[PDB]
Design a protein around this motif. Structure first.
Motif, PDB file in Angstrom:
ATOM      1  N   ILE E  12      61.652  14.352  60.649  1.00 24.81           N
ATOM      2  CA  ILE E  12      60.293  14.498  61.149  1.00 24.81           C
ATOM      3  C   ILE E  12      59.588  13.165  61.403  1.00 24.81           C
ATOM      4  O   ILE E  12      58.901  13.007  62.412  1.00 24.81           O
ATOM      5  N   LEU E  13      59.749  12.214  60.491  1.00 25.67           N
ATOM      6  CA  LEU E  13      59.132  10.899  60.654  1.00 25.67           C
ATOM      7  C   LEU E  13      60.102   9.957  61.363  1.00 25.67           C
ATOM      8  O   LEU E  13      61.304  10.017  61.139  1.00 25.67           O
ATOM      9  N   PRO E  14      59.588   9.082  62.237  1.00 27.52           N
ATOM     10  CA  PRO E  14      60.431   8.127  62.965  1.00 27.52           C
ATOM     11  C   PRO E  14      60.754   6.919  62.085  1.00 27.52           C
ATOM     12  O   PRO E  14      61.679   6.165  62.367  1.00 27.52           O
ATOM     13  N   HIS E  15      59.971   6.741  61.025  1.00 28.62           N
ATOM     14  CA  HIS E  15      60.149   5.633  60.092  1.00 28.62           C
ATOM     15  C   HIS E  15      61.556   5.555  59.512  1.00 28.62           C
ATOM     16  O   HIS E  15      62.153   6.569  59.164  1.00 28.62           O
ATOM     17  N   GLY E  71      50.722  12.028  57.764  1.00 32.66           N
ATOM     18  CA  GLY E  71      51.338  12.318  59.047  1.00 32.66           C
ATOM     19  C   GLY E  71      52.287  13.505  58.992  1.00 32.66           C
ATOM     20  O   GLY E  71      52.305  14.335  59.896  1.00 32.66           O
ATOM     21  N   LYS E  89      56.577  13.126  69.473  1.00 34.13           N
ATOM     22  CA  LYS E  89      55.222  12.838  69.001  1.00 34.13           C
ATOM     23  C   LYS E  89      55.122  11.517  68.249  1.00 34.13           C
ATOM     24  O   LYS E  89      56.125  10.954  67.808  1.00 34.13           O
ATOM     25  N   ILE E  90      53.897  11.020  68.123  1.00 33.85           N
ATOM     26  CA  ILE E  90      53.633   9.813  67.353  1.00 33.85           C
ATOM     27  C   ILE E  90      52.271  10.004  66.705  1.00 33.85           C
ATOM     28  O   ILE E  90      51.384  10.630  67.279  1.00 33.85           O
ATOM     29  N   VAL E  91      52.121   9.482  65.497  1.00 37.16           N
ATOM     30  CA  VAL E  91      50.861   9.571  64.777  1.00 37.16           C
ATOM     31  C   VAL E  91      50.306   8.153  64.647  1.00 37.16           C
ATOM     32  O   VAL E  91      50.756   7.400  63.786  1.00 37.16           O
TER      33      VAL E  91
HETATM   34  O1  LIG Z   1      54.942   8.046  65.351  1.00 35.10           O
HETATM   35  C1  LIG Z   1      54.718   8.566  64.257  1.00 35.10           C
HETATM   36  C2  LIG Z   1      54.095   7.821  63.261  1.00 35.10           C
HETATM   37  C3  LIG Z   1      53.836   8.405  62.027  1.00 35.10           C
HETATM   38  C4  LIG Z   1      54.197   9.728  61.785  1.00 35.10           C
HETATM   39  O2  LIG Z   1      53.928  10.239  60.699  1.00 35.10           O
HETATM   40  C5  LIG Z   1      54.826  10.471  62.779  1.00 35.10           C
HETATM   41  C6  LIG Z   1      55.194  11.794  62.547  1.00 35.10           C
HETATM   42  O3  LIG Z   1      54.987  12.367  61.331  1.00 35.10           O
HETATM   43  C7  LIG Z   1      55.808  12.535  63.553  1.00 35.10           C
HETATM   44  C8  LIG Z   1      56.062  11.955  64.789  1.00 35.10           C
HETATM   45  C9  LIG Z   1      55.697  10.632  65.017  1.00 35.10           C
HETATM   46  C10 LIG Z   1      55.081   9.887  64.016  1.00 35.10           C
END
Ligand SMILES: O=C1C=CC(=O)c2c(O)cccc21
Ligand SMILES: O=C1C=CC(=O)c2c(O)cccc21
Ligand SMILES: [Cl-]
Ligand SMILES: [Cl-]
Ligand SMILES: [Cl-]
Ligand SMILES: [Cl-]
Ligand SMILES: [Cl-]
Ligand SMILES: [Cl-]
Lengths: 152, 150, 149, 152, 150, 152
Positions: E12-15, E71, E89-91
């Motif tokens: 889910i997270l790109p990190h 996020g 997506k990006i947060v």
């Molecule tokens: O680009 C994102 C940065 C933080 C984040 O939590 C996130 C996310 O939870 C899902 C898609 C993209 C991102």
């Protein structure tokens, strides 16, 4: 072909990745003639843990590697323009390196500017020469011949 | 004449990940040195040079030859002297005639062969080749200057 | 012989846990001889130990397990990168390990493993780790190959 | 001799350093008898980049290493007590490893608890045995013999 | 779901390493709150420099972990556990406010993030809460983020 | 107390080391009032391996950290001048962070300039506030309070 490229574009052209991608931005580019690019130097780089403890000096050989990568980008784009798909199948290799001189040490906080110019090019063989500069001063000079080879 | 990593660490100021000499197998004062560095996949540099195709950087082969040359120059004048070693620094002024013939990869024992071409005072000129299993993989000439640390 | 590129196609391990650089001998369901170069330019040496570089004995064992794993993958399915990319390997047991000589930068760590017993994805091998002809370590181990998920 | 030690206390006793110091805290210690300690497992550890991509699994061999270091701490403090000055010039060599069995994979988010008991010790040679636990369940069993030695 | 492990967090997270600071999610209520945590171990590169002989998890990274947890909450609230949509997506985190650090965080600690939705209007999400270690508040903060296309 | 310090000077004052020393050079410094410093941003930093793949973005929280380190360098030299000996007996603890805004993303090739002024200060408690700039444009804003403490 444009004259300004940022890290996003450099990644699509060069195969180099951490910790050997030593070019952060290209500010000038003239097909078959030259390229001016730079790499920021920060203390937050692994290389400084060992070169040297308490005396951070950017390795002269890495300055050269930076000049060559710039040269490689110039050689490739001169031939195929900004083409990621083809770039993905080619790779530049060092054939020779000559007349390398280190004049001034490079340290964290420095903006290592690469200045390469095309001395001779025929097909996949490119001879470039130039300098590395920090705030207008020549910190290094070098000449090298590279080859644009198949990656596979 | 045979120095191991521990001895090397006492002479060269280079530390991870820039100490590129693992062992000294031969050393003749003012004349020559044979040393090597083992190349393994377990090196950080291979993460980016290159992904899915590990190739020890040609510039790092040269750096390896320089470190060997500097070790040669230093020991020739002061021998195995850790204390003095800390008061001197060997930086390179020039590098010339570099040629890469064969790629170096994980599994290779990268052997450095440097001989003193000439020396005058603290200016030393060494040259030679990088060898893997008897074949010349690279060659280069370097000029170094020995100076007081600080 | 199998080189790093080939090893990468079979073993799932990657940096900094891929500890076999080359395979020199391979005999299906019989034995394997491989090695890993040891250089100061490895991150482990920063902590094992400061000012006294000593390749961790546990990593020598890991290197032997990976060698055994390569023997297992190929004995089961041959050199097949496609099936290999869906698997990983788990350590099951370790036994009879003895360390005799410290491995240090500059050493060519050679692995000699033979099959003691195997069934399905479960393989048990044993052998020694060698540096210039001398045994620097002995070990037996059992590992299991399993689907990525 | 206390019975609970934190990372700062461990750093003054064990010669191990990053990335091979695998004991974060000691919760109970009985001289020449037993020790209980633990290491937190997080995704933010370098070994995970390679073991394995997309499926982080703490290496079994590192769990053993962790049990060994817990034993070493026990061994050293049982010998000289808590003395950093004597400790700073010692190292620890693995001598043998036996009867290790891994039952459950250890992953990020786990609190890897080491339980070691002294089976037999003579001078610098300590033979400890025990288990590694996560949430009260035994994830591993091991027996090992290590030697404490003066650096030279 | 309500409990997500590292394999799920990764989808889910790109990190990625060394910036993925959430090891497991233990509680998740769509549009309300999330409880998760990250183990703190000495075997982290960050401790090499923060600080030598005094390992202390950086306060700014505690806030980063809380932001990451917010996020995951926001994202899962909109599309649930959807790896495919996650890649698109990006947060962006726009602001951070009212952060206070009460207790230092060190190796051996189980850093627990407690975040709740403070306000959700359109693509903007405002989250706030605390970071806890063994029941006690070690830090608190408010953050505002925006959802957008990658 | 001069007004410009390079990495060798920052190393002797700040306790931060790789990979958490995020200030490369000091360009302007007025005791008890303000400071201007910067950190070069290069692709060759480990942090970019995970933030994010194929899209290097310098973490907003690290920009705040960078501003804090600049503030701490101001605070220490304000109270003790360039004193490496006393500096070695201290660390800095973040106490609060307020009003932070991230207006522009920071990427490789950027010169992250830190501008901070002293809002309030008494004893070891310093409160600074300011901006982070890239080529004259405000990239981020923040206010923070730190404490210099005896590392005991
Ligand atoms: O680009 C994102 C940065 C933080 C984040 O939590 C996130 C996310 O939870 C899902 C898609 C993209 C991102
Ligand atoms: O470029 C350099 C010029 C002199 C010098 O001493 C030096 C150095 O010591 C290390 C790296 C580069 C240089
Ligand atoms: Cl250099
Ligand atoms: Cl190369
Ligand atoms: Cl060992
Ligand atoms: Cl394992
Ligand atoms: Cl902090
Ligand atoms: Cl960010």
């Amino acid at each position: 072909l444009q004259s300004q490229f940022f890290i996003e574009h450099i990644l699509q052209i060069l195969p180099h990745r951490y910790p050997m991608l030593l070019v952060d931005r290209i500010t000038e580019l003239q097909a078959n003639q030259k390229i001016v690019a730079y790499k920021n130097i920060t203390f937050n780089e692994d290389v400084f843990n060992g070169h040297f403890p308490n005396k951070p000096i950017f390795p002269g050989v890495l300055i050269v590697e930076g000049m060559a990568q710039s040269g490689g980008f110039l050689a490739f784009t001169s031939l195929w323009g900004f083409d990621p798909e083809i770039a993905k199948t080619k790779i530049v290799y060092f054939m020779t390196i000559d007349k390398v001189k280190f004049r001034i040490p490079v340290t964290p906080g420095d903006r290592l500017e690469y200045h390469l110019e095309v001395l001779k090019h025929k097909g996949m063989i490119w001879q470039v020469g130039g300098t590395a500069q920090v705030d207008g001063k020549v910190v290094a000079e070098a000449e090298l011949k590279a080859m644009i080879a198949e990656r596979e």
